[PDB]
């Protein structure tokens, strides 16, 4: 569509409006928005926030009193534009310039002793989470979209902890191989301990799809001696192929309102909802709906459904002003819904799509579950537990078990397509540690309460 | 309508710093029920169904939906910052209160009947009513203070006059050096009075809306029990002949009352309530009195010695309060009962065996016991793993205490996750953690 | 010799018009303002609004504001909206203004977005029992 944001990048034209681009490598996307999302893992003793800030800066936000839900997943993300330095004779990382998104698409070199004009490679978003099990639970069921991953493998610790084994188990489940293991704390770790940790890394990466992955050490605790990553963030650049044109679907991860008390009538704005667009191209002025809508237990007990709709008026990414958004990264929309429903992330776990793109809305379902750990008990008949779907946590009620199969009803309405993933966690001790996951087999539809006046 | 009770649990209540602990004081579950829900029980019993409780959001997240009382609790999240005074806390919640107040602490464990205080309040319609006790001479085994420690405290003086009702003078010797002084003119009206020393206060105060109204404007006042009550007792006579706003906002300004019938009539006052003269009881400038009892149990937990005393001295009140809750719990996997002390409590998820005689003490959840174990007049507490060769003689325990083998100890006070070797002794409770 | 009057109103809409509905409705109210008594359309937190008016005669001010939210009620009802009257027209004092300003600032502070860059979460215990 049309997107400039800042005079650093040129403005796209809202005239053609053609999906024929269909390329992750477009001039006004690799510089404009981060369509390629990369995850970072490593659990404890590394502090990935520091290394993420070293390239982008301060990330992640909260609200303290989230209100209403208080269960929305605390997933954080940031944006960075990598642009390698151009030099006829660059002793790498002298061919590196990557920093934040402020710098234009092709920046004029000002390095001492050389000149020119260097281009970029690809806009990249980084995603992380300050919790161990929640991050794997959330990307297990197709909520965190990514194309590659990184590991910090803390150097200020003993031999790789079982957290690492959990991480390799999760990525083995995910069937992804574009994972870069990055040694940590090389400044405090001496040569002998560095060799020992390297040998342990090689001895533990075997038997996994992550075997043979590039390993490189970074002194991240001091955020100094960062040259190696400064060169291999450009050198290690795997192709993230992506398909764009289809139908617009989105998952809301958070919501809020920008209005402030004392505002007059003429300056009232609608609520804003930010999430991740899964597939399709969203358009300004387009038609969008949310299938679950408002739930209202009537005298019968049936919900109200009501997939309310309103035309989208404004879209943006980070600080720039973008129109005709594309899949990849995390985007917010300033829809025209009244802010009294969009305030303080009132309802999370919804869906967002064009008219006529309403999927099935089943509440009774059947699943195929898989155990992960060794020895474990089979699924319990007529049990209460917690289920996690998309970005949504609720307390279900499993009804029947056909040995390695289960049929379960939900206490709350849920909008899902058949064949997606699901996570199951049991209430134990003083929390719910995750037990397992599965794929939904088939679903009996809830009462069709989609209705209008 | 008649009253609006308030429970004050803002961090320390009065002074938490007098003792050190890893758990917030209201969250502390002594007697297998958290301490703050002992006053709530009596509040429900008398017939109240509304409690405006002020506490930090940390504790509100902490109690984790344990119990559902039939009251109407309205929890308000105090700002965290560092600490606020009691007067400031009452200031922050002003819009909600409409009737008189019944300010209460969050550490009162008592068996008193609330009849007398409200009886006096309705009878003599004064502006204060306190519940106070003769100081309990505390003699007991030392709280692991190596048996050698003394402290110096102010000797407060409290001058109830004749009948044990009217209070006229209250002070402390912290600011005094040798001898006290009085105004003198009071003796011409009440020639005979008496003094009491070393008593026990309660923070159970019944006030009137004029007091809080005056408090709001004044900014120099920061504590309720520290300066406000002495100011009231002083102004009871100070400049009383001078008066009985726009100058330090005189307390005497905000007293307007009369007797008019509108939806709440009254009878003829000639012979209704002790009618002998033309007018006896219709005007009051300021009156302060107390109700002093002489026996029972009306304590408050503000130290560690009080902690032991309240823990060990309320096993029998629980049976009278809740007759349908046995001291034993079926949820615990009790192996033997013949070797169990009858006058002792035990909670859910507990494992015992041969020689597991918990004698006249308390025990919490997730407790694991093996042979040769006693909790003799002690307090074991949550997630404790003990094996053969163990004994205690009375102390405090907390989360993740571990005893492996052959550890026979006397007065074992221990903190979180402190591993203990075999053949260890703790004759001094000290800290360790 | 003047006086201040305050009222409390609740308006919302859940049709297809959206916020553009209520924004259209509220600006009807000040469109019905008289020449001399002005009315301020202020918001403190959605879906609540506060009406404030300076005046010299009580009856005319109260009547005009009453017909004001009456026409607002009918207009919002034409849009499948909601309409609630909570605090009736009432004489206002300085202490009322000070307390409303205090609670206004407090709620503005609460609503503000706080930084959440912290890399540590309390998540080993999230039970609800």
């Amino acid at each position: 569509g049309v997107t400039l944001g800042q005079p650093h990048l040129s403005r796209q034209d809202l005239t053609t409006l053609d999906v024929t681009k269909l390329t992750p490598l477009s001039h006004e996307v690799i510089s404009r928005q981060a369509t390629i999302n990369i995850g970072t893992i490593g659990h404890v003793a590394h502090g990935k926030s520091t290394v993420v800030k070293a390239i982008s800066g301060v990330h992640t936000v909260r609200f303290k009193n989230e209100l209403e839900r208080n269960i929305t997943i605390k997933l954080g993300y940031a944006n960075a534009k990598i642009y390698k330095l151009d030099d006829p004779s660059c002793p790498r990382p002298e061919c590196y310039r990557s920093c934040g998104s402020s710098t234009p698409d092709e920046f004029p070199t000002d390095i001492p002793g050389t000149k020119g004009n260097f281009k970029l490679v690809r806009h990249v978003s980084f995603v992380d989470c300050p919790g161990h099990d929640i991050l794997m639970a959330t990307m297990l069921n197709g909520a965190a979209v990514m194309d590659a991953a990184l590991l910090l493998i803390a150097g200020n610790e003993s031999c790789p902890q079982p957290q690492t084994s959990e991480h390799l188990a999760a990525i083995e489940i995910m069937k992804l191989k574009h994972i870069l293991i990055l040694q940590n704390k090389i400044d405090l770790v001496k040569e002998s301990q560095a060799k020992e940790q390297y040998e342990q890394i090689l001895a533990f990466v075997q038997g996994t799809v992550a075997e043979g992955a590039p390993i490189i050490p970074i002194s991240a605790q001091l955020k100094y001696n960062i040259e190696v990553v400064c060169e291999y963030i450009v050198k290690k650049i795997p192709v993230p192929p992506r398909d764009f044109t289809s139908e617009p679907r989105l998952i809301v991860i958070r919501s809020f309102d920008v209005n402030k008390p004392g505002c007059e009538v003429d300056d009232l704005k609608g609520g804003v909802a930010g999430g991740s667009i899964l597939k399709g191209v969203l358009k300004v002025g387009q038609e969008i709906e949310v299938r679950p809508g408002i739930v209202s237990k009537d005298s019968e007990g049936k919900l109200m459904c009501k997939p309310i709709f309103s035309k989208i008026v404004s879209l943006f990414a980070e600080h720039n002003d973008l129109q005709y958004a594309a899949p990849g990264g995390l985007i917010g929309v300033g829809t025209k819904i009244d802010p009294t429903l969009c305030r303080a992330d009132r309802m999370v776990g919804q869906v967002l799509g064009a008219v006529g793109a309403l999927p099935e809305i089943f509440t009774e379902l059947e699943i195929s579950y898989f155990l992960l750990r060794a020895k474990v008990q089979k699924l319990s008949k007529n049990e209460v537990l917690m289920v996690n779907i998309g970005s949504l946590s609720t307390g279900g009620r499993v009804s029947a078990v056909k040995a390695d199969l289960g049929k379960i009803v939900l206490t709350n309405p849920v909008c899902t397509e058949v064949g997606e993933k699901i996570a199951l966690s049991r209430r134990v001790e003083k929390h719910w540690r995750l037990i397992g996951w599965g794929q939904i087999r088939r679903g009996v539809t809830i009462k069709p309460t989609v209705d209008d006046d | 309508m008649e009253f609006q009770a308030v429970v004050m649990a803002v961090g320390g209540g009065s002074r938490m710093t007098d003792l050190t602990s890893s758990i917030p004081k209201p969250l502390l579950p002594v007697g297998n029920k958290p301490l703050i829900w002992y006053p709530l029980n009596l509040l429900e019993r008398v017939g109240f169904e509304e409690v405006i409780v002020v506490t930090t959001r940390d504790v509100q997240k902490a109690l984790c939906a344990e119990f559902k009382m039939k009251m109407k609790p309205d929890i308000v999240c105090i700002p965290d910052d560092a600490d606020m005074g009691t007067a400031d806390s009452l200031r922050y919640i002003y819009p909600k209160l409409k009737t008189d107040v019944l300010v209460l602490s969050c550490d009162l464990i008592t068996d008193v009947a609330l009849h007398e205080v409200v009886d006096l309040f309705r009878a003599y319609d004064a502006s204060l009513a306190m519940l106070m006790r003769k100081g309990q001479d505390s003699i007991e085994p030392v709280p692991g203070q190596k048996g050698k420690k003394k402290a110096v405290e102010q000797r407060d003086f409290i001058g109830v006059d004749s009948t044990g009702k009217r209070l006229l003078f209250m002070a402390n010797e912290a600011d005094l050096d040798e001898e006290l002084v009085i105004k003198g003119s009071i003796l011409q009206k009440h020639p005979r009075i008496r003094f009491h020393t070393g008593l026990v206060d309660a923070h159970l105060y019944c006030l009137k809306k004029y007091i809080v109204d005056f408090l709001m404007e004044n900014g120099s006042i920061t504590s309720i029990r520290s300066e406000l009550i002495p100011y009231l007792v002083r102004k009871q006579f100070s400049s009383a002949s001078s008066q009985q706003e726009l100058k330090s906002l005189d307390i005497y300004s905000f007293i307007k009352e009369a007797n008019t019938l509108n939806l709440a009539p009254y009878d003829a006052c000639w012979n209704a309530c002790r009618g002998d003269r033309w007018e006896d009881l219709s005007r009051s400038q300021v009156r302060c009195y107390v109700h002093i009892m002489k026996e029972g149990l009306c304590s408050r937990v503000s130290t560690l010695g009080l902690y032991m005393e309240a823990n060990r001295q309320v096993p029998k009140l629980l049976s009278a309060l809740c007759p349908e809750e046995p001291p034993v719990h079926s949820s615990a996997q009790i192996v033997s009962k013949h070797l169990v002390g009858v006058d002792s409590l035990i909670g859910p998820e507990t494992q015992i065996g041969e020689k597991s005689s918990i004698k006249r003490s308390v025990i919490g959840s997730s407790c694991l016991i093996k042979d040769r174990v006693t909790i003799t007049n002690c307090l074991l507490m949550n997630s404790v793993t003990v094996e053969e060769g163990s004994n205690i003689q009375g102390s405090v325990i907390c989360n993740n205490a571990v005893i492996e083998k052959g550890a026979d100890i006397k007065d074992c006070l221990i903190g979180s996750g402190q591993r203990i070797e075999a053949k260890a002794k703790r004759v001094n409770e000290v800290i360790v953690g | 010799q003047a006086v201040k009057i305050r009222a409390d109103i609740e308006v919302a809409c859940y049709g297809y018009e959206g916020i553009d509905a209520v924004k259209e409705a509220l600006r009807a109210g000040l469109n019905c303002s008289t020449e001399n008594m002005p009315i301020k359309i202020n918001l403190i937190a959605p879906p609540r609004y506060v009406m404030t008016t300076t005046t010299l005669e009580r009856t005319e001010g109260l009547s005009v504001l009453s017909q004001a939210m009456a026409v607002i009620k009918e207009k919002i009802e034409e849009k499948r909206g909601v309409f609630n009257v909570q605090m009736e027209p009432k004489v206002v004092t300085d202490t009322d203004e000070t307390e409303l300003a205090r609670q206004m600032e407090r709620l503005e502070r609460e609503n503000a977005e706080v930084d959440g860059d912290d890399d540590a979460e309390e998540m080993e215990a999230k039970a609800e029992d």
């Binding site: 209100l67 209403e68 839900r69 408002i294 739930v295 209202s296 109200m304 009294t340 429903l341 009132r346 309802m347 709350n412 | 509100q60 939906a65 119990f67 559902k68 009382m69 039939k70 609790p73 929890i75 | 859940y14 879906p47 009802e77 499948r80 909206g81 909601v82 309409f83 609630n84």
Partner: peptide, 27 residues
């Protein structure tokens, strides 16, 4: 109505995942 309430949190009627209010009134 019974010994079951346990507020423990706000019960605001505008929650769109548990809506207990005038929802959508009309003429």
């Amino acid at each position: 109505g019974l010994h079951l309430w346990n507020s423990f949190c706000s019960v605001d009627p505008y929650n769109p995942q548990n809506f207990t209010a005038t929802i959508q009134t009309a003429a």
